[PDB]
Amino acid sequence: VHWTQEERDEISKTFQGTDMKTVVTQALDRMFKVYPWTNRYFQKRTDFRSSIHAGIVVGALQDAVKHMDDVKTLFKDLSKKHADDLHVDPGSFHLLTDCIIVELAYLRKDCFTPHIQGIWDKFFEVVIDAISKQYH
């Protein structure tokens, strides 16, 4: 994957000027309602909180944004953790990122243009691939 400066800027700027923690919190809740089967992993953690989890997820994305050209190497362990430890079906990864795009769209309204959506789609595609890599 190759990034243009405009794409880097759109992603980096949004993470520094938008409350991604809230966006991701609402994206998780949206996901649990539209794609109920994803609850599978959390109905077991009695003290699970969307707010805390979102913060943990945004902390990883924020990291991916800083090493955008090496997301695969950066997420190697996170990927192994999801495959071997958590046993998360990698097919569910896009259900969350797709919900984040809906929340970004809902937040930016007419400013979330097809072109801007394309940049985020591209970014989440790179993130899904990096985190799905260590599934053997």
Binding site: R30, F32, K33, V34, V102, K109, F112, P114, H115, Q117
Partner: protein, 140 residues
């Protein structure tokens, strides 16, 4: 498989889309063309943006059909039959594209609608899925 609660949300959303079918539909197609370029393969347009005249006309045909389906939600199979025969026997559009467009309609609604909570999203996603399944039902 539609409760009375989902019926009211759907009808309420069909009302909004009916106001300007071409504008909403054009935006839906533009997102699809940006996110899934392969889908441009069916249209011989010069402008694949929301402003394209051909995209506006097609976008409008698509949304009007969605609005009408939302109104005949009680009998989706008999209502979308002609439309299902058209895609499967005449246009021969690869069915893998239907769900792709459904997600772009969802994103388009989120950027417009004042309220787009998980519940409304779910009701709308359920209608589009039902519509996509009918449209893919007459290929073979």
């Amino acid at each position: 498989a539609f409760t009375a609660c989902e019926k009211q949300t759907i009808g309420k959303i069909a009302q909004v889309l009916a106001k300007s079918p071409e504008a909403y539909g054009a935006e839906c197609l533009a997102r699809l063309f940006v996110t899934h370029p392969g889908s441009k393969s069916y249209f011989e347009y010069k402008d694949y943006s929301a402003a394209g005249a051909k995209v506006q006309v097609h976008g409008g045909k698509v949304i009007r059909a969605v609005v009408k389906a939302a109104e005949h939600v009680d009998d989706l199979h008999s209502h979308l039959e002609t439309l299902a025969l058209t895609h499967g026997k005449k246009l021969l559009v690869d069915p893998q594209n239907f769900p792709m467009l459904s997600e772009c309609i969802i994103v388009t609604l989120a950027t417009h609608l004042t309220e787009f909570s998980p519940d409304t999203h779910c009701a709308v996603d359920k209608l589009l899925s039902a519509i996509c399944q009918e449209l893919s039902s007459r290929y073979r």
